[PDB]
C-alpha cells in the first residue's frame, strides 16, 4: 500500500526527467526517501536477490570486485542472496560476506561466443527463477559483472519491473538511440518509436516480472537465430524491445549505472555503480 509520493519527490530534481508519460518514477539522487522505504520493506521482511554471471576471464577480472562492492552497498539493511553463475567454480573468489548477505554458486556451461554468453543469461535466469529464486526473494536484480557498486544501491530501486537508463543516451532523442533497426530482428524498434535507451547491465523486478522479461528476451534471441540475424546489441536490443512493449514500472537514473569515461556532469550527483573499463582483448576470445 506504498504510495509513490510517500517516498518519491520529483521536485528535488527539477532539471532531469523524473516521471515517464506512463507515470513511472525515474529515480534520481535526491528524489527518494530511503528511510521511509527501508522501514516499509523491513516490516514486510523482504529478501532481495542479485544474479551475476562471470564466464571465462570475467571471473578473475571482475567478480571479486563486483561481489565485494555488492556486499557493501546493495540493499544494506535487508537480507540479500547473491546468485553467482560461473563456468568454473574452482575460480570463484570466496569473499567474506557481511550481515544479511549470503550466496550460492552455480556452474553453467560456457557458450562458445561471448555474444551467446551474454544472451544466454536470459535463458538461465528464467530457469533459476522457476527452480528457486521465485521462492527465495521478493525482488531480483540481474546485473553485469563488469561494474562496481560505489554507494548505497537500496530499496529505492525496487519495483515490479525496473529498467536502467543507459549512461550515454539518457538525454538523447529516441532516433539517436542504438536500438536494433533491422525489421528482420525480433528486437526491431522503428525510428519514431521508443521511450528510453535502457542498459542491459542492470534490470530487475519481482521474480514473476523478471521471468517474463527474460523469457520474452530469450524468445526473441532464439527467433533471430532461426532467421539468421543477431541483434546489434544482443540481449540489450531485446531488452529495449521488451521494455518498449512492457513499460518498466520504475527506471533508475544513470547515477545507478555510470560510465566515468563520460566524466561527471552536473546531473550525476551521487554515483551508486560505475562501469569497469572494457578489457575485451583479455576477457573475450572471439570477435
Ligand atoms: O565472455 C563473457 C561475456 C559476457 N559475460 C557476462 O555477460 C555480461 C555482459 O557482457 P559485457 O559486460 O562484456 O558487455 P558490455 O557491457 O561490455 O557491452 C558480462 O558483464 C558478464 O556478466 C561473461 O561472463 N563472459
Ligand atoms: O549500444 C549500447 C552499448 O553501448 C556501449 O557504450 C558506448 C556508447 O554507446 C557510445 O556512445 C560511446 O561512444 O562509447 C561507449 C563505450 O565506450 C556500452 O559499452 C555497451 O555495453 C552497451 O551499453
Ligand atoms: Mn557490461
Amino acid at each position: 500500500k506504498l504510495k509513490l509520493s510517500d517516498w518519491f519527490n520529483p521536485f528535488k530534481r527539477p532539471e532531469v526527467v523524473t516521471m515517464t508519460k506512463w507515470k513511472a518514477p525515474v529515480v534520481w539522487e535526491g528524489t527518494y526517501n530511503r528511510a521511509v522505504l527501508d522501514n516499509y520493506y523491513a516490516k514486510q521482511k523482504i529478501t532481495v536477490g542479485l544474479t551475476v554471471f562471470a564466464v571465462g576471464r570475467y571471473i578473475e577480472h571482475y567478480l571479486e570486485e563486483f561481489l565485494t562492492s555488492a556486499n557493501k552497498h546493495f540493499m544494506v539493511g535487508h537480507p540479500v542472496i547473491f546468485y553467482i553463475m560461473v563456468d568454473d567454480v574452482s575460480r570463484m573468489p570466496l569473499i567474506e560476506l557481511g550481515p544479511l548477505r549470503s550466496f550460492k554458486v552455480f556452474k553453467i556451461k560456457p557458450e562458445k561466443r561471448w555474444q551467446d554468453i551474454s544472451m544466454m543469461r536470459m535463458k538461465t535466469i528464467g530457469e533459476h527463477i522457476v527452480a528457486h529464486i521465485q521462492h527465495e526473494v521478493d525482488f531480483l536484480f540481474c546485473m553485469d559483472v563488469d561494474q562496481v557498486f560505489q554507494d548505497k544501491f537500496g530499496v529505492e530501486t525496487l519495483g515490479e519491473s525496473v529498467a536502467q537508463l543507459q549512461a550515454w543516451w539518457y538525454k538523447a532523442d529516441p532516433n539517436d538511440f542504438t536500438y536494433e533497426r533491422r525489421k528482420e530482428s525480433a528486437a526491431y524498434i522503428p525510428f519514431g518509436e521508443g521511450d528510453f535507451y535502457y542498459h542491459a547491465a542492470i534490470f530487475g523486478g519481482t521474480p514473476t516480472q523478471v521471468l517474463n522479461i527474460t523469457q520474452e528476451c530469450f524468445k526473441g534471441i532464439l527467433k533471430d537465430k532461426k532467421n539468421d540475424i543477431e541483434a546489434q546489441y544482443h540481449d540489450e536490443s531485446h531488452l529495449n524491445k521488451y521494455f518498449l512493449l512492457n513499460k518498466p514500472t520504475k527506471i533508475l537514473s544513470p547515477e545507478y549505472c555510470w560510465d566515468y569515461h563520460i566524466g561527471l556532469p552536473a546531473d550525476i550527483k551521487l554515483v551508486k555503480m560505475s562501469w569497469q573499463t572494457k578489457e575485451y582483448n583479455v576477457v573475450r576470445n572471439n570477435v
Side-chain angles (χ1 to χ4, degrees):
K1 95 120 138 359
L2 186 62
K3 203 281 114 167
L4 181 60
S5 66
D6 300 332
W7 65 271
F8 181 71
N9 183 352
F11 297 109
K12 294 291 193 200
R13 294 290 308 272
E15 85 289 2
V16 294
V17 175
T18 47
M19 290 280 322
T20 66
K21 84 223 265 284
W22 60 92
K23 295 324 164 262
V26 183
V27 176
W28 289 86
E29 180 62 20
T31 64
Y32 59 88
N33 188 329
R34 196 180 278 125
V36 157
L37 291 170
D38 275 329
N39 174 77
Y40 177 77
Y41 280 122
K43 297 167 85 185
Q44 320 217 293
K45 255 169 82 157
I46 63 168
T47 304
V48 182
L50 178 51
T51 56
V52 65
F53 290 68
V55 175
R57 308 305 173 174
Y58 286 68
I59 299 168
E60 289 98 327
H61 269 250
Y62 302 126
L63 184 55
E64 183 263 332
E65 284 180 57
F66 178 85
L67 289 173
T68 289
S69 66
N71 177 60
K72 180 173 176 183
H73 292 306
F74 188 68
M75 307 292 163
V76 169
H78 305 273
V80 297
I81 304 174
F82 302 131
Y83 304 106
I84 301 146
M85 264 69 55
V86 293
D87 57 318
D88 182 348
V89 179
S90 87
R91 287 147 60 207
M92 166 75 201
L94 254 214
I95 71 161
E96 176 165 308
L97 292 176
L100 296 177
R101 286 82 256 279
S102 61
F103 74 107
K104 60 181 151 179
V105 180
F106 298 96
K107 179 193 169 69
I108 63 168
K109 155 225 195 73
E111 305 296 319
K112 289 94 250 233
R113 302 175 58 247
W114 66 264
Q115 292 97 326
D116 285 315
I117 295 174
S118 182
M119 289 195 289
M120 187 75 20
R121 299 184 284 173
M122 295 297 196
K123 183 185 192 172
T124 301
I125 291 166
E127 287 167 350
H128 284 261
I129 290 168
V130 172
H132 63 93
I133 305 174
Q134 68 173 320
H135 308 300
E136 289 162 354
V137 309
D138 299 272
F139 302 92
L140 171 70
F141 271 93
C142 306
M143 286 186 193
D144 275 18
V145 72
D146 56 330
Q147 54 189 346
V148 181
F149 285 87
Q150 297 292 356
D151 218 307
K152 295 296 164 285
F153 193 119
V155 297
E156 71 286 1
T157 61
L158 302 183
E160 287 271 323
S161 54
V162 183
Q164 175 60 57
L165 275 191
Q166 208 265 16
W168 294 77
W169 304 104
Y170 81 95
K171 279 206 243 141
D173 280 323
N175 289 346
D176 290 323
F177 297 156
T178 57
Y179 292 150
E180 173 56 68
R181 303 300 195 169
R182 284 170 305 170
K183 60 183 140 42
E184 284 82 11
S185 173
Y188 176 62
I189 302 173
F191 289 97
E193 286 175 48
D195 306 304
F196 297 98
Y197 191 79
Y198 303 112
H199 197 179
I202 298 178
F203 59 93
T206 63
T208 287
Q209 293 301 315
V210 175
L211 180 66
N212 201 62
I213 294 161
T214 58
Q215 278 182 159
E216 285 309 296
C217 284
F218 197 57
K219 275 166 47 167
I221 288 154
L222 291 179
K223 171 159 171 297
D224 276 8
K225 281 167 182 314
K226 295 307 182 170
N227 289 314
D228 194 32
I229 178 159
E230 179 171 280
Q232 191 171 165
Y233 296 96
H234 314 109
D235 36 294
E236 189 166 86
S237 300
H238 289 281
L239 182 64
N240 271 280
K241 177 62 161 289
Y242 185 86
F243 279 137
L244 178 61
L245 295 175
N246 310 276
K247 318 288 199 198
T249 64
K250 178 171 294 185
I251 298 167
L252 311 184
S253 90
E255 292 157 326
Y256 284 93
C257 196
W258 183 246
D259 178 5
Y260 276 125
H261 195 65
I262 294 164
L264 190 56
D267 286 345
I268 307 309
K269 305 284 197 213
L270 176 58
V271 167
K272 297 99 175 57
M273 170 99 74
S274 59
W275 305 13
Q276 295 273 207
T277 303
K278 311 299 190 181
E279 297 179 279
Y280 296 156
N281 172 72
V282 173
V283 300
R284 296 176 173 178
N285 306 314
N286 66 283
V287 153

